[PDB]
Amino acid sequence: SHGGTTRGILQIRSDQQQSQHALENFKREWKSSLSGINGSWQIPVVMADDIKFVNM
Amino acid sequence: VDKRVVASFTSRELAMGIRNPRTELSSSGYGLSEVEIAMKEFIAYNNTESFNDRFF
Secondary structure, X not given: OXXXXXXXXXXXXXXXXXXXXXXXXXXXXXXXXXXXOOOOOOOOOOOOOEEEEEEO | OOXXXXXXXXXXXXXXXXXXXXXXXXXXXXXXXXXXXXXXXHHHHHHHHHHHHHOO
């Protein structure tokens, strides 16, 4: 009813944060490739300096 | 058929049988399929089957 169910945070890190535009078209690249049943078994390749997932 | 009337019948010429009747005014005398009630469950089943098959 009220909680945060959020599994965790995907931390991507580089010399500077992406602009909001860059991040929203990265969200479009993500959802058009990986969401739902249609994307269900694909794996993204990402070449950021470091990638971490924090379990909450 | 094809949204035009191709035949008509009296109560004498055609039976109708219904297992799950309703008093609900808008039910208009029609039945109630368990496929309608369970439809979400059937969809969830179908999706989990597709998910497991898509590994291969």
